Design a protein around this ligand. Structure first.
Ligand SMILES: *[C@@H]1O[C@H](CO)[C@@H](O[C@@H]2O[C@H](CO)[C@@H](O)[C@H](O)[C@H]2NC(C)=O)[C@H](O)[C@H]1NC(C)=O
Ligand SMILES: *[C@@H]1O[C@H](CO)[C@@H](O[C@@H]2O[C@H](CO)[C@@H](O)[C@H](O)[C@H]2NC(C)=O)[C@H](O)[C@H]1NC(C)=O
Ligand SMILES: *[C@@H]1O[C@H](CO)[C@@H](O[C@@H]2O[C@H](CO)[C@@H](O)[C@H](O)[C@H]2NC(C)=O)[C@H](O)[C@H]1NC(C)=O
Ligand SMILES: *[C@@H]1O[C@H](CO)[C@@H](O[C@@H]2O[C@H](CO)[C@@H](O)[C@H](O)[C@H]2NC(C)=O)[C@H](O)[C@H]1NC(C)=O
Ligand SMILES: NC(=[NH2+])NCCC[C@H](N)C(=O)O
Lengths: 471, 464
């Protein structure tokens, strides 16, 4: 009917010369095609170029640091010990900060130079063993502890203005003692009041790097001029140095662009730190309508962002009655300030800002998550390009990863951007359409890809566009 | 006599089940249980519970394989229970979406992890992986078309390779745990998510990882003593995979903390980069060997399924032919390889696993309720081993839970999968349901001529 062949007729018809040659021809053709596709894969593999080697980063290259200068104002009344600080590390890990700068805890009386000792703790903070408990408890949550070792931290002149050699001997012993006890770094402040600054900084940096290479030394100055900042960083180049360099002005955005690009050009794109002060809040220098813009800028510039406590909620020392503005109180809840009761509202607190998805704490938490995981924001290359009158735009790109575009508006007027790039590297040229991660002001929702030619900005707005590696 | 020549021992069956169960899931992504569990100890609990619930289904297929004793592994069982319609729907959806996509995806992951030490964080070239995947598919198709013993030898070698690599990872984790740290396992069950929607999703992710315990039921007519060697090999291969899956995650959690586990593209590569200084390419090479071991078992199971579907009246009878010497089902293997090479040409086929998330567990559960219905209707069949009715009932509830998750969430893709599975009904009512000497003659003459030419080319007759 239509059934197939049996074994006998198949064995008698599939043995003729003409079918045998067809079967051997198809077998040899299949094997040469297999070898051809293997050779094509091998040829394509050795013509894909390369990718560069990671740069083997330290722990302070991977996110922000957090300065807690006054300890008893960080908790409140009574519980201002080193013991009470142990209960805050889950809040600190909510921010994803990689290090912590504990303020000076040693015994200082006043200008008496021979009585202050940098090895022995003032009993108003605790004893020697709950410091050890704090170090281990912070090491479990992946938070490093930096110790401030400024000698005369109770007094107007911060480095004991009469003698210069014995206080350098004090710091030289204290570095060794606390490195053996187990701290992960140091900070010395007000180095413009220290004579022979560049010599002692090199020695202390040497001792700290000689113990281990995952140790840090931070120096702070009140300078704002680039030539002194550069003068302290000639022999030393592994030093993090915090200064008042960006706290001058920025009424116009091209001024801030000039400051950032002039610093990075003058030091040769070395690793730097970005802050507004050596010890002060952002609301000591900026109006409250610029805090989101400056927080987007400080997280997407190539270096280590450094903040004090209360910068993530926008704490203002002049928002309430009398108080030392060098050390305001942190507003955890609405009963955090007992005096002048009822003066603290709910959107001024840590607790009341964690639920609002358009608060300042939420922007800090989103930005500090993106800073510690994206490779083009971890060690990417910075490039700024020209834009409209009053803008600051730049791009961060590493190799073949997701690229980031940041556009910021330091102006009290509406702007259309008009990204006149035309000078970028070929590895980071701009697409026609890019995504969104966030904005500082409401009116947009994120994930929706926007076209970069009629890009319009309302005043005091910053954007976090994003785009993948292509050609 | 041209028949299919039963040559599969106990060790070959153990290596088939272990080499299909252990794949790239234990290597590149044991992350779902941890991201929905948010703790180490609760993750280990979910892994053990998923292993127990997969043992409960493996026992049911041991009983079904010794009762019905025909190859096909759910196709034959649905034929024996609710025959005709539903068996054709299962055969159609596995011919159309299930097996070509899974075989192409396994081949693509093999090609991606062969070239990973040359491209460490680099975004490896696209066209070089498709060519290596096509070469891998064609080589394994040739090896299974030559002899059956060659395929069982390949399965043995690469199963030994992947088990030795996982034993190395486990031993490194155990020596670092007992040596001097033991640090992460002191304050477990902290931050745990004891919600229904999280424990359910963690159990779903852990129960997808134990998939593949039904591979030996596809080749039941090729086992030596199927009343002995099938349940013995299932009962040997289940606790091995469960112990390996628990100890590999213990070794992962000893060395790595939670943050870099949850933010890595492959956990075993991060493990190798952190604990092996040099020879950290051993683990991506081992991942490639594991995918090479899985593709062979997938090819053998799909070819035997299409063979049985051709023998049962569906899927025209050229696919039922057997080579006259070297007794291998050559045109079935050729058809399977052609479909996998066709599905390699589609970019972004990783979307396509969202379309048979509902169907696979639906047909597993349909075979379990067919086992229950045959236990009620025909209680006097010869059963060489029958278990209690506890296991089919609890696995029926487990499969109802397994199909309820892609229907509530991800509900658009499941209806697309149901439409794909129902897209073969014009073939069932217009060709298969109508008998012969009533079908159009010009179709029959064409199919007969093509069958005769393929028969002369492949040197293959139907079974005697
Ligand atoms: C320490 O820094 C100095 C220069 O900043 C380098 O050389 C050392 O110079 C001091 C002089 O004050 C000597 O006491 C040391 O013996 C020098 N170190 C040597 C010769 O190795 C050098 O860059 C740093 N020294 C070390 C050991 O790292
Ligand atoms: C840094 O702080 C000091 C004190 O607040 C500023 O003033 C200097 O004070 C010392 C000691 O009184 C004098 O020796 C200097 O001559 C002072 N400098 C000036 C310019 O008056 C100092 O100006 C601050 N630095 C900056 C950049 O503001
Ligand atoms: C800022 O960067 C530019 C470009 O990288 C450099 O300016 C060059 O400086 C050298 C030396 O003075 C001149 O020969 C070049 O002509 C300058 N470039 C241009 C385009 O004019 C330099 O690295 C930085 N500028 C300064 C003043 O140091
Ligand atoms: C916290 O919320 C209150 C009320 O929403 C804010 O108070 C408003 O402040 C703006 C400008 O400061 C005024 O124009 C409104 O009239 C105020 N409304 C009320 C009801 O007082 C307050 O500014 C918020 N705090 C912060 C830091 O943003
Ligand atoms: N029939 C199957 N789903 N087989 C493979 C299942 C997935 C396998 N357990 C893996 O980790 O790769």
């Amino acid at each position: 009917k239509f059934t197939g062949l049996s074994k006998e007729e198949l064995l008698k018809v599939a043995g003729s010369p003409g079918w045998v040659r067809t079967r051997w021809a198809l077998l040899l053709l299949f094997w040469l095609g297999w070898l051809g596709m293997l050779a094509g894969a091998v040829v394509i593999i050795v013509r894909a170029p390369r990718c560069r080697e990671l740069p083997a980063q330290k722990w302070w290259h991977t996110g922000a640091l957090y300065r807690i200068g006054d300890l008893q104002a960080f908790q409140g009344h009574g519980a201002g010990n080193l013991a009470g600080l142990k209960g805050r590390l889950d809040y600190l890990s909510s921010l994803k900060v990689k290090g912590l700068v504990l303020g000076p805890i040693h015994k200082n009386q006043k200008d008496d130079v021979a009585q202050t000792d940098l090895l022995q703790i003032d009993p108003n903070f605790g004893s020697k063993e709950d410091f050890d408990s704090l170090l281990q408890s912070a090491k479990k949550k992946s938070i490093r502890v930096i110790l401030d070792l400024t000698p005369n931290y109770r007094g107007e002149n911060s480095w004991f203005s009469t003698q210069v050699d014995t206080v350098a001997t004090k710091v030289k012993d204290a570095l060794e003692f606390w490195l053996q006890a187990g701290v992960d770094g140091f900070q010395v402040r007000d180095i413009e009041n220290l004579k022979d600054a560049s010599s002692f900084l090199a020695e202390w940096q040497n001792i700290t790097k000689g113990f281990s290479e995952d140790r840090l030394l931070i120096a702070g100055t009140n300078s704002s001029d680039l030539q002194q900042i550069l003068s302290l960083l000639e022999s030393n180049k592994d030093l993090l140095l915090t200064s008042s360099y960006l706290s001058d002005s920025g009424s116009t955005g091209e001024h801030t662009k000039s400051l950032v690009t002039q610093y990075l050009n003058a030091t040769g794109n070395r690793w730097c730190s970005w802050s507004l002060s050596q010890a002060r809040l952002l609301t000591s220098f900026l109006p409250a309508q610029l805090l989101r813009l400056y927080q987007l800028m400080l997280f997407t510039l190539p270096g280590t962002p450094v903040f004090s406590y209360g910068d993530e909620i926008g704490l203002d020392a002049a928002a309430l009655p009398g108080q030392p503005m060098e050390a305001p109180v942190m507003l955890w809840d609405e009963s955090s300030f007992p005096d002048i009761p009822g003066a603290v509202s709910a959107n001024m607190t840590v607790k009341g800002q964690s639920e609002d998805p358009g608060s300042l704490l939420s922007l800090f938490r989103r930005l500090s998550d993106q800073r510690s995981k994206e490779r083009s924001l971890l060690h990417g290359d910075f490039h700024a390009f020209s834009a409209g009158p009053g803008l600051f735009s730049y791009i961060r790109h590493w190799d073949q990863n997701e690229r980031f575009l940041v556009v910021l508006n330091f102006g009290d007027v509406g702007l259309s951007a008009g990204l006149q790039a035309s000078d970028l590297p070929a590895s980071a040229s701009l697409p026609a359409k890019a995504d969104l991660l966030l904005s500082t002001q409401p009116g947009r929702e994120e994930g929706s890809p926007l076209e970069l030619e009629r890009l319009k900005l309302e005043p005091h707005e910053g954007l976090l566009l994003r785009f993948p590696y292509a050609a | 006599q041209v028949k299919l020549k039963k040559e599969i021992s106990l060790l070959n069956g153990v290596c088939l089940i272990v080499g299909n169960m252990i794949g790239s899931g234990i290597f590149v992504s044991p992350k779902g249980v941890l991201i929905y569990s948010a703790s180490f100890g609760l993750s280990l609990v979910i892994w053990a519970v998923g292993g127990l619930f997969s043992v409960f289904g493996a026992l049911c297929y041991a009983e079904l394989g010794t009762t019905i004793k025909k190859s096909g592994a759910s196709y034959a069982y649905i034929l024996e229970a609710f025959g005709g319609f539903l068996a054709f729907i299962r055969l159609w959806t596995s011919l159309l979406i299930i097996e070509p996509t899974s075989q192409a995806i396994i081949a693509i992951t093999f090609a991606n992890y062969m070239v990973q030490p040359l491209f460490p964080s680099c975004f490896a070239p696209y066209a070089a992986s498709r060519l290596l995947a096509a070469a891998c598919i064609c080589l394994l198709t040739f090896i299974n078309c030559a002899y059956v013993k060659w395929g069982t030898l390949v399965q043995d070698i690469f199963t030994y390779a992947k088990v030795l690599a996982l034993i190395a990872v486990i031993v490194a984790g155990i020596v670092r745990l007992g040596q001097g740290a033991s640090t992460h396992f002191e304050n477990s069950f902290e931050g745990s998510s004891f919600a229904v929607g999280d424990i359910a999703l963690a159990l779903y992710s852990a129960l997808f990882s134990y998939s593949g315990w039904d591979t030996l039921n596809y080749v039941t007519e090729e086992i030596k003593n199927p009343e002995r060697n099938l349940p013995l090999s299932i009962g040997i291969s289940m606790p091995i995979v469960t112990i390996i899956y628990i100890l590999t995650n213990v070794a992962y959690y000893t060395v790595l903390d939670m943050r870099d586990i949850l933010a890595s593209d492959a956990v075993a590569v991060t493990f190798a980069d952190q604990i092996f200084g040099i020879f950290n390419w051993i683990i991506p090479l081992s991942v490639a060997l594991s995918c090479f071991g899985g593709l062979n078992a997938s090819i053998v199971a799909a070819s035997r399924l299409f063979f049985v579907g051709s023998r049962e009246g569906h899927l025209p009878d050229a696919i039922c032919m057997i080579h006259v010497e070297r007794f291998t089902p050559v045109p079935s293997l050729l058809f399977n390889g052609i479909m996998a090479l066709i599905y390699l040409c589609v970019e972004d086929i990783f979307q396509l696993i969202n379309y048979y998330s509902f169907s696979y567990w639906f047909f597993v559960g349909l075979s379990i309720v067919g086992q229950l219905y045959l236990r009620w209707k025909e209680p006097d069949r010869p059963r060489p081993l029958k278990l209690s009715v506890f296991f089919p009932i609890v696995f029926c509830l487990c499969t109802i839970f397994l199909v309820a998750v892609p229907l509530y969430s991800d509900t658009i893709n499941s209806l697309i999968g149901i439409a794909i599975a129902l897209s073969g009904l014009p073939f069932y009512f217009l060709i298969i349901r109508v008998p012969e000497h009533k079908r159009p003659l010009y179709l029959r003459r064409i199919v007969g001529s093509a069958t005769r030419y393929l028969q002369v080319l492949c040197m293959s007759v139907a079974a005697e």
